[PDB]
Each structure stands twice: as C-alpha cells, then as structure tokens.
Design a protein around this ligand. Structure first.
Ligand code: HEM
Length: 400
C-alpha cells in the first residue's frame, strides 16, 4: 500500500529519506494522505517544473481530488479564495493588484529601509546583550526582521510592530493552545479591518492604501477582500522567512570554513543565500494541483480529478541537476536550471525578490555586527521543527 505523506525528515536539518530513493527508482508515485485518499508525488526537478507550469492542472481547492494534507486544510478550502488558490485569468487579475511593491526595481528601492530595519534590530540585540546567559536569536532577530518589514509594507504604523509581531508568532507557535492561536488570528484580522477602514478615509504610501484607492473604492474588490489579501501577504511567507534566517545561522555553525569565508567577505551573502534556499527548502508543500483532464507524467497516467504534490525540496536535491546535492556549498558552480526554493511558473513566490533581499541583508550584516556570534547549545541539540513538518528552527540560543 501507498505510504503516508507528508514524510518525516530524516533528522532535524535533513530532508525526508524517501525522496532520494523515489528519485532513483520511482520518481512519480502514489502516496496516502491523512484522510486515506491518494495523491501523486513528483520528485525530480524536471517533473516538478512540469507540474508547476502545466495548464492542465488546477490550484482550485473546491475541485474533486484536491490534495489537502490535514483537516485544517480541508476546512480552509471552504473560504472564498485569494490569488494563491486561483487559476488564470483570476490569478493574475488579483495578484497584479499587489505585485508592484515586490518587483525587482521596487525591492531595490527598498534596500535602505531593509538595511535600517536589520541594523536597528541588531542594535537592540546588542543593547539587550547576553551578559546573563544566551538569548534566543529567533525572538530577538529572526522573527522581527521579516515581521517588521511586511507589516510596514502593508501599512502598520511603527509603534504597533512589536505587539503585532508577538501576536502573529502566537498564532503559529507550537506551544499555543488552540484558543490562544485562534484569538491571535482573529486579533490580526480585526486589526487589519480597522486599518483598511482608516486607509479608505485617508490613504498613505502602503499596500493596503493602494488596494483601497485602486481596487476597493472603484468596486473591483470589497473591503473584506482587501483584508484577506493583506492577511495572505502577512501569513504566506513570514514563518518561512523566520525559519530561513535561523536555518542560515545554524548551517553556518555546521560549516565553519564557509562561515569564516563570509565573516571575511560580506559580499558572499548573495551566494550564501542562493545555496541556503536550495539546500533548506523550508516551504516544500505548496506546489499542489488536481488534474483537470488526464495527463501523463513520466511513466504514470494522472487521471482527471486526481491530486498531485510536486516536491520542490526533492527537486532541489536532484543529483541530475545539482552536483553533490546533499553538500552545502555556497561556492558551487550553478547549473542552467533554477533552484526551486520559491516555486516555479505563474505562482512562483510573489516575494522572491524581497525575501532574497532580506536574507542577503541579514547575512551580509549579522557577522559584521557580531563577529563572535555562536550557537550556544550543541548543534545536535538545536530545537528544530517536528520532523513531520517543513524544516525550520523553533528557537536558537546564541551568545555574541
Ligand atoms: C525565504 C522566504 C520564502 C520562501 C522560501 C517562500 C517560498 C514560497 C513558495 C515555495 C511558494 C509557492 C510558489 C509556487 O506555487 O510555485 C510561495 C508562494 C507565495 N509566497 Fe513565498 N516564500 C518566502 C517568503 C515570502 C514572503 C516574505 C511573502 C510575503 C511578503 C510571501 C508570499 C507568498 C505568496 C503570496 C505566495 C503565493 C503566490 C501565488 O500563488 O501567486 N512569501 N512562496
């Protein structure tokens, strides 16, 4: 019978062991989901790209056979969809309403702001110090960097960032009760609704204001849609950003020669970030589809109304594309094929340029500020996310 999926990571920082075996012997295979239903799992880079781009496959979650991976996903599929779950032409109709803030040119213009935000959080961390024991790099740094940036871009005023950063963290923290997580979720939605009302009356230079002026007031979307689009932009990427920063620090601690290179030359941060986003694919469960019609993938027939999950994590370890794929090597020579940390095709992460700018700013600055930054617990004792989840780090004690 088909194995249960998601698979568990082989260890804290490693992908599931199953993918390498499937790439070698059964690259398109069936897996069993939490409800006992089946889905196709695609593991090779070429095939993941095919799934990501085929117009015979749909992201619409009300379609029969959609591969929801948990009961919570089934419940979330009942809500009015935003662009993450749309096909053409609806997908770009809505995504284009917010894409302008995320273009390469817009992100380049944001660089001084990104640098200031990182610098200010690093200075707060220095002022707080570590004179009485280690501090949690996640709480002090990896969490607020992406949080402050996305909230600011959306339109949150500076005074409200610390509290809203804490509340959004509660929503996904593994220690929160269901009541606590639900209350934090609703608190964020209530806050965003008030902010939308404010920007309908007096727009400012932020994403919510642009939605209000350009889409809500003309009747292209309503104010509840603006809230849901803003909420999507907050929650889609934030936990992934936090995990990528923490994973980068841990990966450098595990690879001290490459850390020494980066300390001696901060201009290596872009290459470090490229290798990090390939090696630690912290969002590996988002390339999902159902077949609108029969489609052949390799030696398998995916029938109409069957689900498909395309593992970009597996694709990023595909030996046929990336030589020595299971070694972290920021000095590698890159092949012609894209790494897939941010997905592929029409739905490729809207924030890829912003996320890479945040990560590059972090890794070109962190060890200039704190040349003696050290993970304070043994590396084998790092508190990674549970093995049945996307790779990440919950907390990371450090000294400096
Ligand atoms: C290192 C950090 C991040 C990683 C690795 C990442 C990864 C991904 C991946 C794998 C997807 C699926 C793309 C696909 O369907 O092919 C995606 C989509 C998306 N991401 Fe990110 N993401 C990151 C940060 C962010 C941030 C900071 C934001 C928002 C500010 C964000 C917003 C979104 C949205 C809205 C989508 C859906 C795009 C669509 O379906 O059109 N992501 N991301």
């Amino acid at each position: 019978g088909a194995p249960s999926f998601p698979f568990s990571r082989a260890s804290g920082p490693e992908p599931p062991a199953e993918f390498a075996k499937l790439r070698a012997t059964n690259p398109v295979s069936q897996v069993k989901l939490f409800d006992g239903s089946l889905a196709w799992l695609v593991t090779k880079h070429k095939d993941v790209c095919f799934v990501a781009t085929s117009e015979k496959l749909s992201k619409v979650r009300t379609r029969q056979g959609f591969p929801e991976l948990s009961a919570s996903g089934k419940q979330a599929a009942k809500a009015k969809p935003t662009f993450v779950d749309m096909d053409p032409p609806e997908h770009m109709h809505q995504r284009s309403m917010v894409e302008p803030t995320f273009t390469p040119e817009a992100v380049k213009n944001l660089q001084p702001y990104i640098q200031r935000t990182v610098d200010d959080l690093l200075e707060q961390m220095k002022q707080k110090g570590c004179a009485n024991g280690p501090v949690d790099l996640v709480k002090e740094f990896a969490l607020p960097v992406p949080s402050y940036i996305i909230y600011t871009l959306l339109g949150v005023p500076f005074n409200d960032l610390e509290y809203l950063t804490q509340q959004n963290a509660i929503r996904t923290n593994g220690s929160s009760t269901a009541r606590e997580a639900s209350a934090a979720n609703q608190e964020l939605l209530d806050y965003l609704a008030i902010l939308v009302e404010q920007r309908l009356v007096e727009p400012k230079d932020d994403i919510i204001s642009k939605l209000c002026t350009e889409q809500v007031k003309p009747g292209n979307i309503d104010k509840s849609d603006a809230v849901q689009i803003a909420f999507l932009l907050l929650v889609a990427g934030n936990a992934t950003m936090v995990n990528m920063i923490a994973l980068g620090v841990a990966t450098l601690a595990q690879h001290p020669d490459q850390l020494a290179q980066l300390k001696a030359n901060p201009s290596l941060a872009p290459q470090f970030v490229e290798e990090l986003c390939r090696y630690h694919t912290a969002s590996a469960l988002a390339i999902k589809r159902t077949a609108k019609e029969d489609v052949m993938i390799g030696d398998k027939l995916v029938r109409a109304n069957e689900g498909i999950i395309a593992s970009n994590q597996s694709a990023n370890r595909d030996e046929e594309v990336f030589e020595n794929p299971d070694e972290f090597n920021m000095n590698r020579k890159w092949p012609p094929q894209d790494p897939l940390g941010f997905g592929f095709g029409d739905h490729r992460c809207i924030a890829e340029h912003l996320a890479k700018a945040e990560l590059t700013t972090v890794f070109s600055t962190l060890y200039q500020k704190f040349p003696d930054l050290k993970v304070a617990v043994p590396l084998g004792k790092i508190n990674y996310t549970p093995l049945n989840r996307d790779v990440g780090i919950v907390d990371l004690p450090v000294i400096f």
